[PDB]
Amino acid sequence: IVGGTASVRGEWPWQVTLHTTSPTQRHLCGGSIIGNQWILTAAHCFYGVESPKILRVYSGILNQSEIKEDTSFFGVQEIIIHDQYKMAESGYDIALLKLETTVNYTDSQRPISLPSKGDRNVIYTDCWVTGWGYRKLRDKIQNTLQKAKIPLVTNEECQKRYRGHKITHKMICAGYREGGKDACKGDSGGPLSCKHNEVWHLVGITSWGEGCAQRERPGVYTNVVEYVDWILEKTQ
Numbered sequence: 001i002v003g004g005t006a007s008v009r010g011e012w013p014w015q016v017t018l019h020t021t022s023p024t025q026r027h028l029c030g031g032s033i034i035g036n037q038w039i040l041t042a043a044h045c046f047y048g049v050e051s052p053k054i055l056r057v058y059s060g061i062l063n064q065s066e067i068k069e070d071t072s073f074f075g076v077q078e079i080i081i082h083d084q085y086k087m088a089e090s091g092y093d094i095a096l097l098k099l100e101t102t103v104n105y106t107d108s109q110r111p112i113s114l115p116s117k118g119d120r121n122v123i124y125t126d127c128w129v130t131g132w133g134y135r136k137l138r139d140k141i142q143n144t145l146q147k148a149k150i151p152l153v154t155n156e157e158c159q160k161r162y163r164g165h166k167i168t169h170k171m172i173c174a175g176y177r178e179g180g181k182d183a184c185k186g187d188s189g190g191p192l193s194c195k196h197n198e199v200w201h202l203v204g205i206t207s208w209g210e211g212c213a214q215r216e217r218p219g220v221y222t223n224v225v226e227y228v229d230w231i232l233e234k235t236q
């Protein structure tokens with residue numbers, strides 16, 4: 001997260017850190033708890049992943065340095081990548097992880113609601129992007145979960161900034177005209193969370209952008225509301 005600030009324990013209880021264990025253990029991507037056995041993340045995260053055997057999902061983490069050889073985690077039973085996914089910039093950047101067991105919800109690990117049926121025309125003004133990613137294009141993974149408030153921008157403005165890409169209704173863009181706050185390397189797969197009527201909704205999945213926090217270059221997110229049917233079909 002560029003231009004962000006440190007989170008506190010319990011602040012974003014749906015945020016998970018997805019680790020790979022090959023060839024060494026390390027944070028790979030963010031993700032969001034959306035059900036007791038279900039993580040929503042980005043399909044791009046699994047480019048190099050030979051199978052679910054090498055994944056570990058950690059919840060209730062604030063600092064990466066909390067994770068030791070005895071820290072409990074959830075195994076991944078299945079990776080479900082949208083069957084049209086090809087690359088992040090062309091969309092469908094969405095995946096479900098089915099965990100090997102059910103999360104017991106606690107203060108530190110809680111689900112975030114999907115965008116609600118009938119909210120298709122809500123104007124979200126309180127959106128936040130979170131993660132352990134770089135603070136700049138050439139940085140390192142951050143020990144403490146970072147947060148930044150970023151405004152949504154219209155797809156029409158987003159397309160004008162990305163004339164080499166097809167910005168579709170299955171994408172949602174967010175960023176400041178002058179840059180300064182954005183996701184960056186290591187944040188993808190995590191949530192763009194928006195609070196409406198004091199309820200958090202998983203509005204976006206951190207996906208791609210040209211640079212990090214550049215002027216006139218919004219971050220691009222998977223538009224979760226357009227995948228609710230697909231999620232419900234996979235999880236039901």
Ligand SMILES: COC(=O)Nc1ccc(-c2cnn([C@H](CC3CC3)c3ccc(-c4c(-n5cnnn5)ccc(Cl)c4F)c[n+]3[O-])c2)cc1
Binds near residue numbers: 027184185218
């Ligand atoms: C020691 O290093 C470790 O152990 N960890 C470590 C873990 C992951 C990575 C790493 C590198 N890239 N990525 C992902 C894509 C990869 C498949 C996972 C990625 C792509 C794009 C964006 C992104 C951007 N950016 C544009 N330019 N950069 N960011 C802008 C806006 C928005 Cl909205 C964005 F989403 C964010 N991420 O995360 C992850 C590096 C090191």
